[PDB]
Amino acid sequence: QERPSETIDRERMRLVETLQADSGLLLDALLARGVLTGPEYEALDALPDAERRVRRLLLLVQGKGEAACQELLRCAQRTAGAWDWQH
């Protein structure tokens, strides 16, 4: 069905809204899983704007492909959680 990168594209607003408060922890979780490099993680951790921080993480992760996207979503949903109106 839906590719992880497509999930991120469709849920971009919700992810950006629900992940801001704990974006540091998310960065940490993703560094510890190899999804981010050290420099990537520093660059993102240093952004003072937490919304832009999440927005850029999402883009960075979409650019790395589907596995990276899955990893972000699995970490995301631990803090943010996972009707049929699209039909």
Side-chain angles (χ1 to χ4, degrees):
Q1 63 296 333
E2 201 176 64
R3 296 184 172 92
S5 60
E6 288 162 349
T7 304
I8 287 179
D9 227 280
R10 172 172 63 77
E11 288 304 324
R12 195 178 301 277
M13 175 186 284
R14 178 183 164 293
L15 294 161
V16 163
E17 180 172 349
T18 54
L19 289 179
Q20 292 193 11
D22 309 312
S23 49
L25 304 176
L26 181 57
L27 294 191
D28 299 352
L30 292 171
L31 173 67
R33 279 162 180 74
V35 175
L36 300 169
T37 69
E40 280 165 352
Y41 167 96
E42 294 294 347
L44 288 168
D45 199 50
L47 289 180
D49 185 357
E51 183 167 313
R52 278 190 167 76
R53 171 187 304 148
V54 174
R55 285 169 56 201
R56 285 167 182 268
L57 174 59
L58 297 185
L59 290 164
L60 174 71
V61 139
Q62 288 186 294
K64 292 175 187 262
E66 303 305 335
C69 291
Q70 290 171 337
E71 205 55 70
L72 179 131
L73 296 165
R74 283 193 293 267
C75 290
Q77 75 181 6
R78 289 195 255 268
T79 45
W83 66 294
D84 208 332
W85 60 269
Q86 125 279 327
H87 153 263

